[PDB]
Design an enzyme around this catalytic site. Structure first.
Site, mmCIF file in Angstrom:
data_model
loop_
_atom_site.group_PDB
_atom_site.id
_atom_site.type_symbol
_atom_site.label_atom_id
_atom_site.label_comp_id
_atom_site.label_asym_id
_atom_site.label_seq_id
_atom_site.Cartn_x
_atom_site.Cartn_y
_atom_site.Cartn_z
ATOM 1 N N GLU A 81 37.058 48.645 38.297
ATOM 2 C CA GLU A 81 37.512 48.094 37.064
ATOM 3 C C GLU A 81 36.184 47.229 36.557
ATOM 4 O O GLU A 81 35.915 46.027 36.321
ATOM 5 C CB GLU A 81 38.431 47.005 37.132
ATOM 6 C CG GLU A 81 38.982 46.250 36.005
ATOM 7 C CD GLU A 81 38.660 44.814 36.112
ATOM 8 O OE1 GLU A 81 38.353 44.187 37.281
ATOM 9 O OE2 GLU A 81 38.424 44.141 35.211
ATOM 10 N N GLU A 132 45.262 52.985 36.174
ATOM 11 C CA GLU A 132 46.093 52.219 36.654
ATOM 12 C C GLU A 132 46.779 51.706 35.395
ATOM 13 O O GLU A 132 46.772 51.163 34.602
ATOM 14 C CB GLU A 132 45.615 51.060 37.311
ATOM 15 C CG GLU A 132 44.582 51.218 38.487
ATOM 16 C CD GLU A 132 44.136 49.831 38.859
ATOM 17 O OE1 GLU A 132 44.767 48.747 38.727
ATOM 18 O OE2 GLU A 132 43.091 49.888 39.375
HETATM 19 O O1 PTQ Z 1 47.235 44.214 41.001
HETATM 20 C C1 PTQ Z 1 46.322 43.808 39.773
HETATM 21 C C2 PTQ Z 1 45.365 45.038 39.792
HETATM 22 O O2 PTQ Z 1 44.263 44.604 38.819
HETATM 23 C C3 PTQ Z 1 43.452 45.949 38.389
HETATM 24 S S1 PTQ Z 1 42.404 45.136 37.327
HETATM 25 C C4 PTQ Z 1 43.345 45.057 35.791
HETATM 26 C C5 PTQ Z 1 42.708 44.224 34.631
HETATM 27 C C6 PTQ Z 1 43.631 43.975 33.535
HETATM 28 C C7 PTQ Z 1 44.302 43.020 33.539
HETATM 29 C C8 PTQ Z 1 45.464 42.630 32.716
HETATM 30 C C9 PTQ Z 1 45.570 43.774 31.531
HETATM 31 C C10 PTQ Z 1 44.655 44.766 31.761
HETATM 32 C C11 PTQ Z 1 43.823 45.107 32.709
HETATM 33 C C12 PTQ Z 1 42.543 46.289 39.802
HETATM 34 O O3 PTQ Z 1 41.702 47.166 39.558
HETATM 35 C C13 PTQ Z 1 43.620 46.405 41.055
HETATM 36 O O4 PTQ Z 1 42.675 46.435 42.189
HETATM 37 C C14 PTQ Z 1 44.575 45.397 41.194
HETATM 38 O O5 PTQ Z 1 43.774 44.122 41.569
#
Ligand code: PTQ
Ligand SMILES: *[C@@H]1O[C@H](CO)[C@@H](O[C@@H]2O[C@H](CO)[C@@H](O[C@@H]3O[C@H](CO[C@H]4O[C@H](CO)[C@@H](O)[C@H](O)[C@@H]4O)[C@@H](O)[C@H](O[C@H]4O[C@H](CO)[C@@H](O)[C@H](O)[C@@H]4O[C@H]4O[C@H](CO)[C@@H](O)[C@H](O)[C@@H]4O[C@H]4O[C@H](CO)[C@@H](O)[C@H](O[C@H]5O[C@H](CO)[C@@H](O)[C@H](O)[C@H]5O)[C@@H]4O)[C@@H]3O)[C@H](O)[C@H]2NC(C)=O)[C@H](O)[C@H]1NC(C)=O
Ligand SMILES: *[C@@H]1O[C@H](CO)[C@@H](O[C@@H]2O[C@H](CO)[C@@H](O[C@@H]3O[C@H](CO[C@H]4O[C@H](CO)[C@@H](O)[C@H](O[C@H]5O[C@H](CO)[C@@H](O)[C@H](O)[C@@H]5O[C@H]5O[C@H](CO)[C@@H](O)[C@H](O)[C@@H]5O)[C@@H]4O)[C@@H](O)[C@H](O[C@H]4O[C@H](CO)[C@@H](O)[C@H](O)[C@@H]4O)[C@@H]3O)[C@H](O)[C@H]2NC(C)=O)[C@H](O)[C@H]1NC(C)=O
Ligand SMILES: *[C@@H]1O[C@H](CO)[C@@H](O[C@@H]2O[C@H](CO)[C@@H](O)[C@H](O)[C@H]2NC(C)=O)[C@H](O)[C@H]1NC(C)=O
Ligand code: NAG
Ligand code: NAG
Length: 986
Positions: free
Chosen positions: A163, A261
């Site tokens: 990310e 994800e």
């Molecule tokens: O459980 C959360 C997970 O968030 C994502 S980033 C997601 C960033 C995001 C947040 C909100 C909306 C879209 C993307 C990570 O890659 C994982 O390791 C884990 O930490």
């Protein structure tokens, strides 16, 4: 990135290809480090394969594998070899995501705590950071490289970094030389499969076409409801993503639309809502609306984070979470698949894997009032010339809980048709979404259209079977192009049901209408047999694949439209196999049920379930109906309050006879921590001395200058930490913690001192883990643990010097338990000594009767501020060879109880941090394999009373879930070392 490096895994605009076959990748996230029982990985892989998924995505946590810098260790419970072997045995492919940075709600986001000694900005091309990752990536990418599909293993895709989506103000982003170095480390170690990324949103970072640092397939994430589970019914306006098809075409039209994800639950902090409430927000309604909305955009690589969460055992989690990582996922922490969202996800996995037309249909813009006269529903078309069309229907307000009546007008090979053609209206109930199809191939047959959803279909020896479903009380219609062939006689036959109606046109199109209910309808049209069920009935159907041959036998005959058997009934169908003239099924049962087996291979005449032969009734359609013996026993487990408890004082530091000559000196006058420059004369940061896990202790010597002195002390342990202070044996006070406090400033009076005399302050500072680093350029993982600042002043205002010693886990980076890893132990006396290990030295503990003045039971606790450790032998003799019986330890949170913290240990593994005044966790599952169900176990409870009146555990019990009669492969006990006296301990 300039194309594939191998021809096994390739891609184009529409999909991945594996061995030349187009496939929809439907994957679930599983973290092998969160389940340290190697024999249970096949259990979770069977549960995910039964959804119709073909892939698992996994992280690797660097902090567990290189706790000592320069010493990579991935042995025993930390080896990936049993994880790879279980994926091959289950017929699952893998997406490997080794980091180095993984985020993942783990301590440090995966970074070992010794990165706090690296000056340079993390996740940049600062060379001290880059080169600190080299040994780990060289080792973990070479182990993944050996497991690639090109070498006969399960790995088909690799994600570098995590990310990588923005940066702090003033920091170069995207930093393309940094990105490229991370790619180069993987390619240099032998990774040749495609590289995929996981941008937070469709920002385009690393997309094909962006030059240096680009990956092969652009991926992004989606968590549209966020992570706060306060209001699980609330789906807010603008929550549904509606731009992702056009964003994909604008960023990476050459590669498959990939959600690397997508929300399968949420994390939960200390002081949070609990994962049951997260599972209510990301429930079966969320899956049917939001996951079908991703199919509306033509997703063809789709991974659900999390599918099985596991547990943050042994301090591996970050401060923004607690011990459980159930995540509200479709598979619970204790591996049960009772949530309704599991069965709903299975309906979607099984549909996509028999629907190759969906891959090459083209998604178009969403519409309103175009494919239906009604404007109360939105419909997104996926269109093709001849290979079939798909239509995702939802309420116009995607949140609506109302019921709408509608009809559709859909293009077909016979022209545009308003359906139902035989009269009536369709219904969309609250928070539902449907996929309708036109010109959908069913083997040799074709559905000109269907309103009902497809669960599965297959062509067998004597018939083709199609299973269709609808919600209860919904009218549905479908039409089959002439299924009779040349035949003049041929007519439909009603086999089951009294609501289905049949109408034939002059060109022999057969139109069927039915209203879904508990009563299945079955109709035979030539050799096509259609089973028409309601949704709740379809939840109980399974489509295990028939094995092929050789090492890859479990991957079946193909990924899409595999050779299969259809089974109606059971809590889980794990597998089928042909053994001579017998069909052998492995299954689990949590309730009694019959099994109906549909599509028996030719020449097969015997049935076994879990290794036991049984008879069966034969229906007129050639299906088998069997009645396996299912006994669900009453399980009795030992009462914890009645075990023989032993107690040892775990704060001997505060007694006048304590010798600290063996403790490390806190005498570093400088630190390399650039995020938190020193305010004190020496570093009091644990990680500066090699202590990255669990509770820290500091001992500060000073000579009293005046009879009264004032101490200011600033401590930091991470969100929901606590700290306690003593002056010699005198309790001074505690910071008792709250969810929003990661540090505390405390002021105490140190009174009644003898001038000239030396005093020792003992300061205990818990740590709830190292923070993540999710914004590159903000070195938040470097937030230290320990003492940030202090001042000790005399009553005339003079500064009084303190000289310090400290400890965390015994040995620091030279940690003592290589089997259980670098994070399992903190620095409390009982941990240092190894008294949490099996077969502890009972001569060093005391025992006395419960409810008495010398009680050694945690239910009686201690009458002063302090820390005690309690240990007891827990024999279990449960029928684990036949049943899966989930066990957990439950603390009673009594509204009138003094505040305390507790640690749970089972056979030497830390399996819970309990914080009575912060919560929310009261129930701590521990898996079989860590527990021995036919032998002795050791359990341990540390009790830290934070206030001067002491504390006790108000109740503690062992709880069982309803036993599941199981066809799993046998769980082997994890054999961790027992207690041995430690040289050099203190
Ligand atoms: O459980 C959360 C997970 O968030 C994502 S980033 C997601 C960033 C995001 C947040 C909100 C909306 C879209 C993307 C990570 O890659 C994982 O390791 C884990 O930490
Ligand atoms: C046993 O039983 C007892 C008795 O029932 C239980 O005790 C009760 O425990 C609760 C929960 O811990 C506790 O209530 C909390 O109290 C704290 C402290 O407040 C008091 O003290 C402070 C300090 O002096 C004062 O300033 C206050 O005025 C007050 O007196 C308070 O911080 C809590 O506030 C949160 O919850 C309220 C809703 O209930 C909100 O109104 C607040 O705004 C605040 O909201 C945060 O937390 C919510 C819950 O998770 C969340 O929905 C919300 O979005 C917000 O989250 C953000 O902040 C929190 C930190 O507060 C943080 O954790 C989140 O971080 C996560 O998310 C980020 C973004 O995604 C992510 O980046 C990060 O990584 C994530 O971690 C997020 O930033 C609340 O009021 C009661 O006081 C207490 N009662 C008693 C009588 O003692 C006990 O818990 C039980 N024990 C067991 C074992 O179950
Ligand atoms: C053994 O293992 C099996 C699995 O193999 C386990 O069985 C599972 O058990 C769980 C727990 O009980 C079940 O989930 C819970 O289900 C209840 C009941 O509702 C379901 O069944 C009824 C039929 O009995 C359906 O009518 C329900 O569907 C209607 O309502 C839902 C809204 O709840 C709606 O989405 C549907 O579209 C449908 O609406 C239609 O009907 C309604 C009512 O007539 C009507 O108003 C509407 O217009 C439509 O016409 C539903 O399928 C449910 O109440 C629970 O939900 C609540 O809790 C969860 C949080 O926990 C929240 O997410 C949710 O929002 C609610 O607040 C649960 O979903 C699961 O279904 C069941 N699965 C199977 C396969 O049976 C056993 O428990 C295991 N047993 C043991 C001993 O281990
Ligand atoms: C979309 O539909 C939802 C779900 O019905 C509406 O949410 C409701 O709003 C009312 C009025 O404000 C609240 O009192 C309800 O409790 C809400 N229900 C739920 C389940 O959250 C929503 O307002 C509609 N949105 C729009 C733009 O029309
Ligand atoms: C600072 O980092 C260097 C590595 O560049 C190392 O030699 C030194 O001992 C570190 N000092 C501290 C105080 O961590
Ligand atoms: C502690 O006080 C110092 C000095 O005033 C201040 O810099 C710091 O932010 C405070 N920390 C907390 C947790 O309040």
């Amino acid at each position: 990135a300039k194309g594939p490096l191998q021809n096994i895994v390739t891609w184009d605009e529409h999909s991945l290809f594996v061995h030349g076959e187009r496939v929809v990748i439907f994957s679930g996230e599983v973290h092998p480090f969160r389940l340290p029982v190697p024999s249970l990985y096949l259990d979770v892989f069977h549960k995910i394969k039964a959804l119709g998924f073909n892939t698992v995505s996994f992280y690797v946590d660097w902090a567990l594998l290189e706790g000592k810098p320069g010493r990579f260790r991935a042995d025993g419970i930390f080896s990936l070899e049993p994880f790879f072997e279980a994926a091959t045995k289950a017929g699952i492919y893998l997406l490997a995501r080794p980091g180095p940075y993984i985020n993942a709600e783990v301590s440090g986001g995966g970074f070992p705590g010794w990165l706090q000694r690296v000056k340079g900005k993390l996740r940049t091309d600062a060379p001290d950071y880059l080169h600190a990752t080299d040994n780990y990536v060289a080792h973990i990418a070479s182990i993944i490289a050996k497991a690639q599909i090109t070498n006969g293993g399960p790995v088909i895709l690799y994600q570098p970094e995590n990310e990588y989506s923005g940066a702090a103000e003033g920091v170069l982003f995207p930093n393309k030389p940094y990105m490229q170095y991370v790619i180069d480390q993987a390619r240099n170690a032998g990774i040749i499969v495609p590289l995929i990324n996981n941008d937070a949103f469709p920002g385009g970072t690393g997309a094909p076409g962006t030059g240096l640092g680009s990956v092969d397939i652009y991926g992004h994430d989606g968590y549209p409801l966020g992570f706060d589970c306060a209001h699980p019914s609330a789906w807010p306006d603008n929550g549904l993503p509606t731009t992702w098809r056009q964003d994909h075409l604008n960023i990476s039209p050459s590669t498959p639309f990939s959600l690397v994800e997508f929300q399968g639950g949420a994390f939960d902090p200390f002081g949070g809502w609990g994962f049951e409430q997260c599972s209510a927000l990301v429930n079966h309604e969320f899956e049917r609306v939001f996951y079908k909305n991703n199919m509306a955009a033509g997703v063809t690589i789709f991974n659900i984070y999390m599918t099985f969460g596991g547990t943050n055992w042994g301090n591996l989690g970050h401060p923004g979470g607690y011990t459980s990582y159930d995540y509200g996922a479709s598979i619970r922490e204790d591996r049960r698949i009772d949530r309704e969202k599991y069965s709903e996800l299975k309906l979607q996995g099984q549909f996509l894997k028999v629907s190759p037309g969906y891959i090459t249909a083209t998604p178009e813009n969403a519409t309103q009032g175009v494919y239906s006269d009604s404007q109360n529903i939105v419909i997104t078309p996926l269109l093709a010339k001849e290979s079939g069309d798909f239509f995702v229907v939802r309420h116009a307000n995607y949140s609506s809980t109302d019921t709408a009546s509608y009809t559709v007008k859909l293009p077909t090979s016979a022209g545009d048709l308003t359906i139902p053609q035989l009269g009536g209206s369709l219904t969309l109930t609250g928070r539902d979404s449907k996929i309708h199809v036109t010109d959908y191939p069913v083997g040799k047959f074709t559905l000109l259209y269907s309103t009902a959803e497809i669960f599965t279909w297959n062509e067998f020896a004597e018939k083709t079977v199609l299973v269709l479903y609808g919600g209860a009380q919904e009218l549905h219609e479908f039409a089959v192009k002439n299924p009779f062939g040349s035949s003049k006689t041929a007519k439909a036959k009603k086999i089951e049901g009294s609501n289905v109606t049949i109408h034939t046109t002059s060109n022999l199109t057969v139109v069927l209408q039915w209203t879904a209910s508990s009563a299945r309808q079955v109709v035979q049209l030539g050799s096509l047999v259609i089973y028409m069920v309601d949704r709740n009935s379809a939840y109980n159907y399974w489509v295990p694949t028939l094995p092929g041959s050789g090492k890859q036998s479990a991957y079946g005959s193909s990924l899409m439209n595999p050779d299969s058997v259809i089974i109606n009934g059971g809590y889980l169908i794990r597998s089928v196999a042909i053994k001579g003239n017998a069909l052998s099924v492995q299954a689990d049962f949590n309730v009694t049920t019959p099994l109906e087996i549909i599509g028996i291979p030719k020449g097969i005449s015997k049935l076994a379930v879990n290794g036991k032969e049984l008879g069966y009734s034969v229906s007129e359609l050639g299906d088998w109906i069997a009645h396996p013996a299912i006994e669900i026993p009453h399980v009795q487990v030992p009462e914890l309050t009645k075990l023989k408890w032993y107690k040892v004082d775990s704060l001997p530091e505060i007694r006048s006879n304590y010798d600290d000559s063996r403790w490390p000196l806190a005498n570093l006058r400088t630190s390399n921590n650039t995020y938190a420059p020193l305010k004190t004369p020496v570093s009091l940061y644990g990680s500066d001395y090699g202590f990255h896990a669990g509770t820290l202790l500091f001992r500060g010597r000073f000579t009293a200058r005046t009879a009264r002195q004032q101490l200011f002390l600033s401590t930091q342990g991470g969100s929901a930490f606590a700290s306690s202070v003593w002056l010699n044996d005198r309790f001074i006070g505690s910071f008792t913690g709250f969810d929003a406090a990661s540090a505390a400033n405390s002021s105490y009076t140190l009174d009644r001192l003898v001038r000239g005399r030396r005093y020792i302050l003992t300061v205990v500072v818990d740590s709830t883990g190292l923070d993540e680093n999710w914004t590159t350029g903000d070195d938040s993982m470097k937030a230290p643990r320990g003492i940030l600042d202090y001042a000790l002043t005399s009553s005339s205002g003079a500064n009084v010097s303190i000289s310090w010693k400290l400890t965390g886990n015994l040995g620091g980076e030279d940690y003592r338990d290589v089997f259980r890893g670098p994070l399992n132990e903190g620095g409390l006396f009982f941990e240092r000594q190894g008294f949490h290990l099996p077969s502890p030295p009972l001569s060093d503990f005391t025992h006395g009767p419960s409810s008495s003045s010398s009680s050694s039971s945690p239910l009686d606790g201690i009458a002063h501020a302090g820390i005690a450790f309690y240990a007891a032998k827990l024999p279990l003799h449960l029928p684990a060879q036949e049943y899966d019986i989930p066990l957990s330890f439950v603390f009673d949170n009594a509204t009138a109880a003094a505040p305390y913290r507790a640690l749970l240990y089972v056979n030497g593994f830390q399996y819970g941090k309990y914080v009575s005044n912060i919560g929310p966790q009261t129930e701590f599952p521990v898996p079989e394999g860590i527990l021995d169900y036919n032998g002795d176990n050791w359990i341990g409870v540390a009790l830290w009373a934070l206030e001067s009146r002491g504390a006790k555990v108000p109740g503690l019990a062992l709880k069982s879930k309803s036993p599941i009669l199981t066809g799993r492969e046998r769980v082997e006990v994890v054999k961790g070392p027992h207690f041995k006296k430690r040289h050099g301990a203190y």
